C-alpha cells in the first residue's frame, strides 16, 4: 500500500473500478487515475448515451462532461461526501485526461477485479467513455489522442534504450559462477 498509486484506466469498467477506488480513498491511499477516456460501460453505445441525456435533462445541477468528471461523479456516489470523512477523501482522488507528464514516468497498476475482458462475456455490447462524452459536449477528444500518440513515441523509444540495457545485464548474468548456488537455493 504505497502512499501514491496510479491506476491506468484503459479497459477498466467505470462502475467496478470506482467501487474499488472509493474504498481505497477512504482507507487513506492517494489514488490517481490516468487515461480516463478509455473507460468502459456495459451496454451498447446508444444506450449509455440516453442514460446520459437524462442527466442533462435533470436541471434545476452542473452536468460535468469530461471523462474524468464522469468518473469523479461515479466515485462521489460511493463516498460519504457530505461528511468531512468523505469530503477529505474526495480530494485525494485525482482523475486526469490521458497521462500528464508528472505521472507518465511512474509505473501504472491495473485492477484485476474490474478489467473489461475478465468481467464481460465475449461479444457483449459496451461503450468507451471517451467516445461517449465527445458526443455529449466534450470538445477535447482529438487533442488528447494526438498527445497520447506523442507520449507513446517517447515511451516506446525509452523502452528500446532500456531493453538493450537490460539485455547487456541479461548477457552478463550467466558469467557469475554463483549461478549453481543460485539454483540450489531456487533463486
Amino acid at each position: 500500500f504505497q502512499k501514491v498509486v496510479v491506476i491506468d484506466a484503459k479497459g477498466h469498467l467505470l462502475g467496478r473500478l470506482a467501487s474499488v477506488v472509493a474504498k481505497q480513498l477512504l482507507g487513506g491511499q492517494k489514488v490517481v487515475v490516468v487515461r480516463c477516456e478509455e473507460l468502459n460501460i456495459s451496454g451498447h453505445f446508444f444506450r449509455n448515451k440516453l442514460k446520459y441525456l437524462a442527466y442533462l435533462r435533470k436541471a434545476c445541477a452542473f452536468h460535468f462532461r469530461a471523462p474524468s468528471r464522469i468518473f469523479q461523479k461515479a466515485v462521489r456516489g460511493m463516498l460519504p461526501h457530505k461528511t468531512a470523512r468523505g469530503q477529505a477523501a474526495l480530494e485525494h482522488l485525482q482523475a486526469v485526461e490521458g497521462i500528464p507528464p508528472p505521472f507518465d514516468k511512474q509505473k501504472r497498476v491495473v485492477v484485476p477485479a474490474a478489467l473489461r475482458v475478465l468481467r464481460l462475456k465475449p461479444g457483449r455490447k459496451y461503450c468507451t467513455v471517451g467516445r461517449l462524452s465527445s458526443e455529449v459536449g466534450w470538445k477535447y477528444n482529438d487533442i488528447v489522442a494526438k498527445l497520447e500518440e506523442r507520449r507513446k513515441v517517447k515511451s516506446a523509444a525509452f523502452y528500446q534504450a532500456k531493453l538493450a540495457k537490460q539485455k547487456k545485464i541479461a548477457s552478463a548474468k550467466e558469467a557469475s559462477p554463483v549461478n549453481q548456488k543460485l539454483s540450489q537455493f531456487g533463486y
Binding site: 498509486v5 509505473k107 497498476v109 491495473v110 485492477v111 484485476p112 478489467l115 475478465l118
Partner: protein, 174 residues
C-alpha cells in the same frame, strides 16, 4: 447435499390386516428425516395409507456403485405449475446418480423456477446406449472425436492470489 435412500415400510398390522405389504421407494433427501417426510407424501397422495397407522422397517443409503464410470441418466419428472401437471423427461450426463439429480434441481429451479416440494421425481434410469439417448448435445458429447478449448477462458486460472488489488501487469488470459 442429497443422498440415495431406499425406504421400505408398511402399515401397522391389525386383526383385519395381519400381514401388510412392504412398499419400497428409491427417493432422494438431504437427511434421513426428510426421506420419511417425502415417503409419506409420495405414498399418501397415491395409495392413501395413513401416517399414524404406518411404521418404517428400514432406511438405507445407497452409495453410487460405479461412481468413476461416466454415465448418461434419464430422468422422468412431473412439473407442477399454474396448471400442475407436465410430463417432462430430462436427460443429464454425469458420474453419480445423486449428482445428476442435483443438476436437475439446479436446472429446474433455474430454467423453470421450480420448487422442491412442487417437483416430484418420477423415475431415474441409466441410459447405456447412445442410440437410446435422445438429446443432440448429449449425442454430440458422446461422439468419438470430442474436442473443444476450455470454455470461459477467464474462469481458468482466474486471478490466482489472495487479495490482488492493483496487479502490476495486464493478464494474458489466453
Amino acid at each position: 447435499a442429497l443422498k440415495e435412500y431406499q425406504v421400505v415400510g408398511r402399515k401397522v398390522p391389525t386383526e383385519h390386516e395381519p400381514v401388510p405389504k412392504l412398499f419400497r421407494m428409491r427417493l432422494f433427501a438431504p437427511n434421513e428425516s426428510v426421506a420419511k417426510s417425502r415417503y409419506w407424501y409420495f405414498l399418501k397422495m397415491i395409495n392413501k395409507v395413513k401416517k399414524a397407522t404406518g411404521e418404517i422397517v428400514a432406511i438405507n443409503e445407497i452409495s453410487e456403485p460405479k461412481p468413476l464410470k461416466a454415465k448418461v441418466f434419464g430422468i422422468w419428472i412431473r412439473y407442477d405449475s399454474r396448471s400442475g401437471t407436465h410430463n417432462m423427461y430430462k436427460e443429464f450426463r454425469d458420474t453419480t446418480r445423486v449428482g445428476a439429480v442435483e443438476a436437475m434441481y439446479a436446472d429446474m429451479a433455474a430454467r423453470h423456477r421450480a420448487r422442491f416440494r412442487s417437483i416430484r421425481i418420477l423415475k431415474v434410469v441409466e441410459v447405456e446406449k447412445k442410440e437410446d439417448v435422445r438429446r443432440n448435445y448429449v449425442k454430440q458429447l458422446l461422439n468419438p472425436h470430442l474436442k473443444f478449448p476450455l470454455p470461459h477462458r477467464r474462469t481458468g486460472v482466474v486471478g490466482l492470489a489472495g487479495k490482488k488489488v492493483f496487479a502490476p501487469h495486464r493478464p494474458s488470459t489466453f
